[PDB]
């Protein structure tokens, strides 16, 4: 996925941030980041739905091989780095290097389990869920490396049929959910220092889980590897 580095406007203005993937045959999901150590939050997702709690100024629309994140009235407070995802033929949920756009002229998920581990070891994080009914969305595990963007890590259906992983751990994930306990589980073994990062939990909206499709993240554990 290829979006832009930068983009800037003044307080008022339309802003418009494009994505553009490998083929037009998936869509988009626009996930807000105001600072590196803090939780995404979901804008826009399946190209054009907006959650009921976000401000009708951010729509989103798709054209061809390219989904577009509209700002119309951009305020001070949307200043943050926006990343797309999406999905592709090989992999369920991709995303873009983010866009950090500069304004001018100025449902809980719980994670645990981070920690320092040595290389070769393995991870447990679990995240308690709360809020809604949680045997009845799909849920996954995105991760951040410092100074780098979103990555996608495992992704389960709702009642844990089917998982999938991001390139760089599959075959050393593995994720499974509890949905007595309200709770989602990754096991991530054999570790290595490109692991390092922070943690998120994600839940997808009810249509399946895609990088371009999730409505929730909680505040992320960090992982140290060394």
């Not at 091989?65 to 369920?92: H, K, M, N, P, R």
């Not at 719980?110 to 393995?122: H, I, M, V």
Request: hydrophobic content about 30%.
């Amino acid at each position: 996925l290829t979006q832009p580095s930068s983009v800037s406007a003044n307080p008022g203005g339309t802003v418009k941030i494009t994505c553009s993937g490998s083929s037009s045959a998936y869509g988009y999901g626009w996930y807000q980041q105001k600072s590196p150590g803090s939780a995404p939050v979901t804008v826009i997702y399946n190209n054009n739905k907006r959650p009921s709690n976000i401000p009708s100024r951010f729509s989103g629309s798709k054209s061809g091989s390219t989904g577009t994140l509209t700002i119309t009235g951009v305020q001070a407070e949307d200043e943050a780095v926006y990343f797309c995802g999406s999905e592709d033929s090989s992999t369920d949920a991709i995303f873009g290097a983010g866009t950090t756009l500069t304004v001018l002229g100025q449902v809980t998920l719980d994670e645990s389990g981070g920690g320092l581990q040595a290389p070769g070891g393995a991870l447990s994080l679990v995240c308690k869920a709360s809020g809604f009914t949680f045997s009845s969305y799909d849920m996954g595990w995105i991760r951040q490396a410092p100074g780098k963007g979103l990555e996608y890590v495992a992704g389960i259906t709702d009642n844990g049929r089917y998982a999938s992983y991001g390139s760089a751990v599959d075959g050393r994930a593995t994720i499974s959910r509890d949905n007595g306990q309200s709770s989602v589980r990754l096991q991530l073994n054999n570790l290595r220092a490109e692991d390092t990062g922070t943690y998120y939990c994600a839940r997808d909206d009810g249509s399946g889980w895609t990088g371009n499709s999730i409505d929730a993240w909680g505040h992320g554990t960090e992982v140290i590897v060394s």
